[PDB]
RNA sequence: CUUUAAAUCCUUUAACGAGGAUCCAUUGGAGGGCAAGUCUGGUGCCAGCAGCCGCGGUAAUUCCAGCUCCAAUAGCGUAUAUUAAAGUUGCUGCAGUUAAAAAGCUCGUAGUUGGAUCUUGGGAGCGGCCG
């Protein structure tokens, strides 16, 4: 959070949901930080860096999490266009 | 007298590898081991007991009464907590309530009123909390007005570090435990509110599991 | 509200008047029969004369005989049952004496454990009962 | 038809809760620290601070670049500077709300006489105000409820009709000397 | 001395005027609300206390008296109208299945409320598309 001195007086910044554009609470223990590896650009290996996502609890309560992961991997560059 | 951790969280915070509990709040890690707060929060933490309510069963051979303890915990510049424990012995009730109040600790953030000068002192927006029929409202106030409420959210907001509030209670307020839980739920929804401040799409840092799995693969089995 | 249009006001005034008339305390405060049935008639205190001193029983959970003074008013002339407040102060009030009768505090209603008696006595023979209790003055013979 | 004023106001106010621990203990701590006679004085100072805070809030609820708001804010800032409670480093309308009751009670004449080294105790300072011993700018003050302004702080000294700062000795010294001279002669 | 049509009101000033200041600070309370004793004697459902719950039946943290105690303290307590508390009159801002509360149903004159659409865009120029 801003100030007239140009300093961040807020103690920490919570993360954001990648499927609902919401704020993850500290007591919300249903939030998922999925890690997805990428394949090597040459033949088949793992390059080393990590590609991660996030999701909130209420989506997983309702159920539409698999579609969210599918569109995130499709627009990110993992799933092919035809699918 | 020496704490031995059970889960990996206690081992990671005991082996001086986890810096603070701020990233524990950031990654929403489930806290279930009691003295993580004792390792992280120092001597600024204090405690006070709200009310003791006796509840009775009914049996063919008389009635059995057990204590129900309500407690409010938190350092005066930082976080809060709450704990409800029921036991036959009053000392075990207070001890279990203290342990549960150290367990359920939430982070809070503070805003300004109009002018963005100095340190924050009040709630950023109009938040609320409900349980049963109790409806507790929080309205931001100008600096130096002081918190205007009943005595128990007064002491809760003085251990919350927030100096200025306006309240509006509804329903049966005479149940002190439900009223305390309602204002705790009101103060717990401070971070669950989207603002134009937090419109930035945040970046992802390394998870404590992802960076300490090389340690916990050989620390304990 | 329910009538919530831009050009409706008189319906809201009539409904507010009717629903305020359906209240109980405002009906007690704005009708002449409640002030007429009250023996004081809007007076905080009223003087009267003593014709008989008869005690009355208590309620169920306690058993005592708290003695009361029946006082006929002067401004109206009706038989009103008062109640002596303190202990050992009944003997100060005798027959055909001048007393000052005031209520007890519950807006003109029965109070505590005394049935049908609503008012109390503050002065007798132009001297207060507290002075006779504390020994600050004497009864004028 | 008479030529009378009938302009009176209540300076002290009473809180709603009569018996609570924190307010009574804090008011008693202020009374013991600053030598107040009763809680009416600290209630009066709290009411004046509340009126100043209400004026500040009624000025912050107006927008900028307005002549009335700027004039009232500037005049309030000059008054709060001239009563000596604030410093010239932070002279803005938003700092009016960040004032304490000890800031107002520090500018009292009793605490000023106690802090200038001309009095030993706080109660002794209150007595010395009430005993008509000192003066400011050749004018004696017998009242402890005085707000000392900033430009008149170095003009505080004992009165010329006082035996402490130079004057006629009091009644006790002449009585003791007369008794000793009568006993000797 | 001054003031006033002369005094009495205030200010000023000679002379007296305190050491247990006796030159006496009182008023309600002490179970809870509500700050304040498991102190001591008396009657022990009688006398009484208590705005409400309640306290009195032979060991009363409440009755009647002594000390201590707590609140404002030259002030404190009681009665009676009134306001905030009352989101229990709800326009802001109530409730209508079960706590009080949707007419047996429908038509219908007053009253309240009522679908979309009719003029966009530009340049000179203060400048690194636009205030």
From Swiss-Prot, chain A:
Keyword tags: Acetylation, Cytoplasm, Endoplasmic reticulum, Isopeptide bond, Ribonucleoprotein, Ribosomal protein, Ubl conjugation
Name-wise, this protein is: Small ribosomal subunit protein eS21
Cytoplasm: is it a keyword of this entry?
yes
Q: PROSITE patterns, alphabetically?
A: RIBOSOMAL_S21E
A GO molecular function assigned to this protein is: structural constituent of ribosome
The UniProt family comment states:
Belongs to the eukaryotic ribosomal protein eS21 family.
Q: Which organism's genome codes for this protein?
A: Oryctolagus cuniculus
A Pfam family: Ribosomal_S21e
| Superkingdom of source | Eukaryota
Q: What is its main location?
A: cytoplasm
The gene is RPS21
**Places the protein is found:** Cytoplasm, Cytosol; Cytoplasm; Rough endoplasmic reticulum
Record text on subunit structure and interactions: Component of the 40S small ribosomal subunit.
Swiss-Prot record, chain C:
List of residues that carry N6-acetyllysine:
134
The N6-succinyllysine modification is found at: 53
Q: Which GO terms describe its molecular function?
A: structural constituent of ribosome
What InterPro entries has UniProt attached to this entry?
A: NA-bd_OB-fold (IPR012340), Ribosomal_uS12 (IPR006032), Ribosomal_uS12_euk/arc (IPR005680)
Q: Where is the composition biased (Basic residues)?
A: 1-19
What job does the chain carry out?
Component of the ribosome, a large ribonucleoprotein complex responsible for the synthesis of proteins in the cell. The small ribosomal subunit (SSU) binds messenger RNAs (mRNAs) and translates the encoded message by selecting cognate aminoacyl-transfer RNA (tRNA) molecules. The large subunit (LSU) contains the ribosomal catalytic site termed the peptidyl transferase center (PTC), which catalyzes the formation of peptide bonds, thereby polymerizing the amino acids delivered by tRNAs into a polypeptide chain.
As for subcellular location, the record says: Cytoplasm, Cytosol; Cytoplasm; Rough endoplasmic reticulum; Nucleus, Nucleolus
Q: What are the 3-hydroxyproline sites (modified residues) in this protein?
A: 61
UniProt GO BP: translation
| PANTHER family, per database record | 30S RIBOSOMAL PROTEIN S12 FAMILY MEMBER (PTHR11652)
Family in the record? Belongs to the universal ribosomal protein uS12 family.
Assigned keywords, A-Z? Acetylation, Cytoplasm, Endoplasmic reticulum, Hydroxylation, Isopeptide bond, Nucleus, Ribonucleoprotein, Ribosomal protein, Ubl conjugation
Write out the PTM section of this UniProt entry. Answer: Hydroxylation at Pro-61 affects translation termination efficiency.
A Pfam short name: Ribosom_S12_S23
Q: Where is this cross-link: Glycyl lysine isopeptide (Lys-Gly) (interchain with G-Cter in SUMO2)?
A: 36
Subunit field text: Component of the 40S small ribosomal subunit. Part of the small subunit (SSU) processome, composed of more than 70 proteins and the RNA chaperone small nucleolar RNA (snoRNA) U3.
Instruction: One GO cellular component term, please give it.
Output: cytosolic ribosome
Specify where the region named Disordered lies, as residue ranges. 1-25
Alphabetized CDD domains for the sequence: Ribosomal_S23 (cd03367)
Q: What protein is this chain from?
A: Small ribosomal subunit protein uS12
Swiss-Prot record, chain D:
Q: PTM N6-acetyllysine: list the residues.
A: 65, 115, 154
Q: Which Pfam families match?
A: Ribosomal_S4, S4
Q: What is its main location?
A: cytoplasm
Q: Which InterPro entries match?
A: Ribosomal_uS4 (IPR022801), Ribosomal_uS4_CS (IPR018079), Ribosomal_uS4_euk/arc (IPR005710), Ribosomal_uS4_N (IPR001912), S4_RNA-bd (IPR002942), S4_RNA-bd_sf (IPR036986)
Q: Which Gene3D superfamilies does this entry report, sorted A to Z?
A: RNA-binding S4 domain
Q: What are the UniProt keywords, alphabetically? A: Acetylation, Cytoplasm, Isopeptide bond, Nucleus, Phosphoprotein, Ribonucleoprotein, Ribosomal protein, RNA-binding, rRNA-binding, Ubl conjugation
Ranges where the S4 RNA-binding domain occurs:
107-181
SMART domains in the record: Ribosomal_S4, S4
GO biological process annotation, one example: translation
Q: Where on the tree of life does the source sit, at the highest rank?
A: Eukaryota
Family named by the database record: Belongs to the universal ribosomal protein uS4 family.
* Record PANTHER family: 30S 40S RIBOSOMAL PROTEIN, SMALL RIBOSOMAL SUBUNIT PROTEIN US4
Binding partners and assembly = Component of the small ribosomal subunit. Identified in a IGF2BP1-dependent mRNP granule complex containing untranslated mRNAs. Part of the small subunit (SSU) processome, composed of more than 70 proteins and the RNA chaperone small nucleolar RNA (snoRNA) U3.
Give a short account of what the protein does. Component of the small ribosomal subunit. The ribosome is a large ribonucleoprotein complex responsible for the synthesis of proteins in the cell. Part of the small subunit (SSU) processome, first precursor of the small eukaryotic ribosomal subunit. During the assembly of the SSU processome in the nucleolus, many ribosome biogenesis factors, an RNA chaperone and ribosomal proteins associate with the nascent pre-rRNA and work in concert to generate RNA folding, modifications, rearrangements and cleavage as well as targeted degradation of pre-ribosomal RNA by the RNA exosome.
Name by which UniProt lists this protein: Small ribosomal subunit protein uS4
